[PDB]
Design a protein around this nucleic acid. Sequence first.
DNA 1: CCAGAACATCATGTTCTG
DNA 2: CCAGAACATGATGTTCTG
Lengths: 72, 70
Amino acid sequence: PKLCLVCSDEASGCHYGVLTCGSCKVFFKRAVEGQHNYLCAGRNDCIIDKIRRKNCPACRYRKCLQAGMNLE
Amino acid sequence: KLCLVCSDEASGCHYGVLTCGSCKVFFKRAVEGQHNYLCAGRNDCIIDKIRRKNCPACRYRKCLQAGMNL
DNA sequence: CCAGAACATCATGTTCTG
DNA sequence: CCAGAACATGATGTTCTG
Ligand SMILES: [Zn+2]
Ligand SMILES: [Zn+2]
Ligand SMILES: [Zn+2]
Ligand SMILES: [Zn+2]
């Protein structure tokens, strides 16, 4: 098996340049195309795992960027 | 005038406390649903009009600290 | 005016299609 | 295999109903 570089769930494949799970793949594509602006309610360092990833879009988006996801 | 939980514009006195509509229904569903809420932070999230949706654990906790019940 | 239900929209995740 | 669209669903918020 292989892990999502963003949320540590089971990766489904290489998406947007990075190993990710399906949910993170479509989250990113949705985050980079739409207007959302996200606000972190903690300290910009929220725990993004399978359980908590939808708590903080802001921190999930940032982790997406830091892993190097991009549309091409 | 301001929701004690999220500082959004309150609507009336709900469950003991001046809160907004969204907080009223969140609180009732919280208590009467008993979901496993988990904070992604340190159990001290900021809860305002936007951030209240981020962390229902902290939101439900702040409701309690405000005095909401029944 | 307020509680509870009903409705409407959000946000997310799986599945399908190209 | 991967991207983009379509579908499915549970959480949130507003409106109606008692
Ligand atoms: Zn992921
Ligand atoms: Zn965060
Ligand atoms: Zn509120
Ligand atoms: Zn929290």
